[PDB]
Write a protein that binds this ligand. Structure first.
Ligand code: A1EFE
Ligand code: A1EFE
Length: 147
């Protein structure tokens, strides 16, 4: 009926239906449109105190909580979806991954090289699509599939 991992849902404030993808954690109002060896993604990582390495080029000692980290991710997603800010601009300034220097880009990759929730989401995104918050041992990700 619907593409991989999508379900119908109802907005709690509106009452109108919307669509949600439990693999990528994306949500939209529109019924989603319509697998390759490799995909190409960029991402924005917000680490927290339980990240595998609680440190980054932005902070020698990352001390925020997972909940605080999720709030930061949600903020960026709002600004990206509203158009006030571009994904590349926010990655470049705020991602705790060193890939921030490259506007968040990671290159292309196959299944089995990335952490699994990141890989599942990356491969479930269509080209040009953004994910919701995705959780890994590194922290909370916003993923943009570019190829
Ligand atoms: O940390 C992994 C990673 C991957 C791609 C990059 N481009 S620039 N810095 C990078 C870092
Ligand atoms: O996965 C580690 C990694 C991968 C690609 C890179 N380009 S430049 N720095 C990098 C680091």
């Amino acid at each position: 009926k619907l593409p991989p991992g999508w379900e119908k849902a109802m907005s709690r404030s509106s009452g109108r239906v919307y669509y949600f993808n439990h693999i990528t954690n994306a949500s939209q109002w529109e019924r989603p449109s319509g697998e390759p060896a490799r995909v190409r993604c960029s991402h924005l990582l917000v680490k927290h105190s339980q990240s595998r390495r609680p440190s980054s080029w932005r902070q020698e000692k990352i001390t925020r909580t997972k909940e605080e980290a999720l709030e930061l991710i949600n903020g960026y997603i709002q600004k990206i979806k509203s158009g006030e800010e571009d994904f590349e601009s926010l990655a470049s300034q705020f991602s705790d991954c060193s890939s921030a220097k490259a506007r968040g880009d990671l290159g292309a990759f196959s299944r089995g090289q990335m952490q699994k929730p990141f890989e599942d989401a990356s491969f479930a995104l269509r080209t040009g699509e953004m994910s919701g918050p995705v959780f890994t041992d590194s922290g909370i990700h916003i993923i943009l599939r570019t190829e």
